[PDB]
Write a protein that binds this DNA or RNA. Structure first.
Ligand code: GTP
Ligand code: GTP
Ligand code: GTP
Ligand code: GTP
Ligand code: MG
Ligand code: MG
Ligand code: ZN
Ligand code: ZN
Lengths: 339, 347
DNA sequence: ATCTGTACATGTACAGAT
DNA sequence: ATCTGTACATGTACAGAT
DNA sequence: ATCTGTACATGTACAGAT
DNA sequence: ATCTGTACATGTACAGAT
């Protein structure tokens, strides 16, 4: 039943090949153009495709163009925890996010203009968004969200001190090492000079290193169903989102965040046995429903930032989604059979 | 259970002793390391790498023996395996002073290393420290220190190579079911080391850096022995086995062919065979130590203990240790086992 | 003025001491 | 159970070199 | 600084065995 | 139906060459 839904959601090797061939061509060319400002940006592949939790089709790719910036001093934007002003080549741009993003965007647009071999344009800017989004066609439509990121090597900002609570799951050495990696700021505004913390590199490591046992999902270990539960939850939200515009405030990052909390609460690999796929997916739904009822879903890395605060999503939107989730749950998920 | 807990208490190093030992050792090592740079010496660029029992937290009784590698990156090198041994190699291509004819001479390089070290120790006035008489074929320059208490420091010259590990290790390090494939792949991306062992130009592979990572990352669960996880008894078993051999070795010269590396190697195989943290529960310390002894005994009787990293190299071959020596040790181990380990009460 | 090899500054796991 | 010394990895300041 | 070569993890596809 | 073995595909870290 759920195994059959997963088969439908499984990407095809043929489609992966053709999509990657084109995406890589464009990304490689844009990256080269950035190397003569922005000289020295490096590529960092992130999100669902590179975490192996993309579903249905290879039609959405996420790439960070990270740029190492020396001595930078952060000031937290009021008490938000996730948003910062940045202070001290890039003198052209207090470091303005929208100004930097504009130049980044312009360069990208100029280079896409010179691309004749592939059918590719740049999507109209969504205000406040950090992304420069490319729309490709080898007939099939493919999105590429290209994210400018500042890389900083200092200690992570104080607001994350008590975040990433993996100690009982992945452990203290993993946590200490992860927090020795750089941190990232992307120009998602809150206004025009604000940046937002990104942990896409950390999320990627976790997705690919997700077990309490080192062998989880390896050739000489036991398969778990952690990723399959993530896929099913993503698909449920995607399907619901297609039908009801009441759910515009919700995104896949809410699901990702929720499952991180679940994986922390249930650290044992044996609590995610493939044979218990139903129970596992069900307990995930129950957890997400408690998050909705209590209007509380803390950022996994920034515990004081509630993604489900009133200020961000209306009670009515949360109650709408609850009713819709409870319905699918108690009727054998008819929405999975939809197209 | 509790008898063995009491032995471990005795074996536990004291923080006072650790402090005083480390203070002195670090002073000497730092000074020797600086001498290798600050002068236009062939060893310019050596880096320090702390290895062995003290740095793995399995040193027992006293902080009286420290192991330190002075590693030197050597680019374009071609290795030739010395007669299918698997562990021994000739090296070919600053260091031209030792490059006796395409071949990089181990003993020549070790001699110069040794001379420099001797000269620098001679200039040390703060501390009571001399250089021990060279043991032929040994790779070590050994320092003997006294803040009254006697402390050995074995300083090992090592060539660092960043290429893939030699073919003879391909099927070694069988940690797939225990620490897993990602850990193994990453470990094998680290450099490999050659220490100075026809004979005078041969070098031997070293995996001290890999052994160190394993000792400190020894569980199938990432939380093994961490503040938010469960204690295992893997290291405690290693200490007990080390102590049994150490005690036996100080009494009987019949056991001169044996060393702590045999015990370390044996326990690596045991940890591979019994990968689950639950097979090394603290409450089962006795059973765990017992099964280790039984395994070591089988190795001795069948004359077979494969190097953990170089499977075709048998540390217990006839060619290396007489059957007599192995039978002597078997009898001695079986005796202690079946009489409540009287040798643990000694001293 | 700028760059750099060396030493120090900071954080934390591990294990011993209390 | 909490506190504390050592080791070790990574960042960063800087007298000496360029 | 950039580019490639190598090795192997994480996938998908499918047949034969269980 | 599930598991196991092989083949085929992509991603990615890092060394050595340029
Ligand atoms: N902090 C933060 N990170 C976000 C947010 N949205 C997206 N991200 C990050 O950007 C990545 C890409 O976002 P998306 O492409 O929308 O989602 P995805 O995880 O790739 O999954 P898909 O919906 O299958 O594409 C996510 O995996 C996160 O790492 C957000 O609101 N906050
Ligand atoms: N890799 C990565 N991609 C990100 C991150 N933040 C945002 N993105 C990308 O940018 C897209 C839009 O970012 P959002 O966080 O949704 O921002 P927005 O669309 O301006 O605002 P809302 O969706 O209303 O919150 C995401 O779908 C991702 O593809 C991040 O931290 N990392
Ligand atoms: N391949 C190999 N490595 C060895 C051998 N002897 C020692 N080593 C390595 O060098 C390290 C130091 O050796 P020792 O000081 O004799 O032993 P140890 O492991 O530190 O334990 P102690 O007996 O407490 O000193 C070991 O941990 C090994 O990594 C040997 O015969 N062969
Ligand atoms: N760190 C480190 N120390 C090593 C290594 N190999 C040897 N040593 C040290 O050097 C000492 C002598 O090396 P061995 O190979 O044991 O000496 P040998 O002269 O060949 O003979 P025995 O000591 O009788 O086995 C060891 O006890 C260690 O202290 C190595 O790979 N790494
Ligand atoms: Mg995505
Ligand atoms: Mg030692
Ligand atoms: Zn898994
Ligand atoms: Zn343990």
């Amino acid at each position: 039943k759920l195994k059959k839904v997963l088969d439908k959601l499984r990407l095809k090797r043929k489609d992966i090949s053709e999509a990657a061939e084109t995406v890589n061509k464009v990304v490689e060319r844009l990256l080269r153009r950035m190397q003569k400002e922005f000289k020295g940006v490096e590529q960092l592949n992130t999100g669902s495709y590179y975490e192996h939790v993309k579903i249905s089709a290879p039609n959405q790719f996420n790439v960070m163009f990270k740029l190492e910036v020396p001595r930078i001093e952060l000031q937290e934007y009021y008490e938000t925890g996730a948003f910062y002003l940045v202070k001290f080549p890039l003198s052209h741009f207090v470091l303005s996010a929208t100004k930097m993003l504009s130049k980044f965007r312009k360069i990208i647009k100029e280079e896409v203009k010179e691309i004749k071999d592939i059918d590719v344009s740049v999507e109209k800017e969504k205000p406040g968004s950090p992304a420069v989004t490319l729309l490709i066609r080898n007939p099939e439509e493919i999105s590429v969200d290209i994210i400018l990121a500042l890389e900083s090597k200092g200690s992570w900002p104080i607001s994350t001190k008590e975040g990433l609570p993996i100690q009982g799951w992945l452990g203290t050495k993993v946590r200490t090492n992860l927090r020795r990696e750089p941190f990232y700021l992307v120009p998602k505004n809150a206004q025009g000079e604000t940046w937002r913390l990104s942990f896409s590199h950390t999320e990627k490591y976790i997705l690919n290193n997700h077990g309490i046992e080192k062998t989880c999902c390896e050739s000489s270990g036991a398969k778990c169903c952690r990723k399959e539960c993530l896929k099913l939850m993503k698909y449920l939200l995607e399907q619901l989102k297609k039908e009801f515009q009441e759910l515009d405030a919700f995104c896949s990052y809410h699901v990702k965040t929720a499952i991180f909390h679940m994986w922390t609460q249930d650290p044992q690999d044996s609590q995610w046995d493939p044979r218990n796929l139903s129970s596992c997916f069900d307990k995930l739904l129950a957890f997400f429903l408690e998050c909705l009822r209590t209007e509380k879903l803390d950022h996994y890395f920034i515990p004081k930032f509630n993604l489900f605060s009133q200020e961000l999503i209306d009670r009515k939107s949360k109650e709408f989604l609850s009713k819709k989730i409870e319905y699918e749950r108690n009727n054998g998920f008819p929405i999975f059979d939809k197209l």
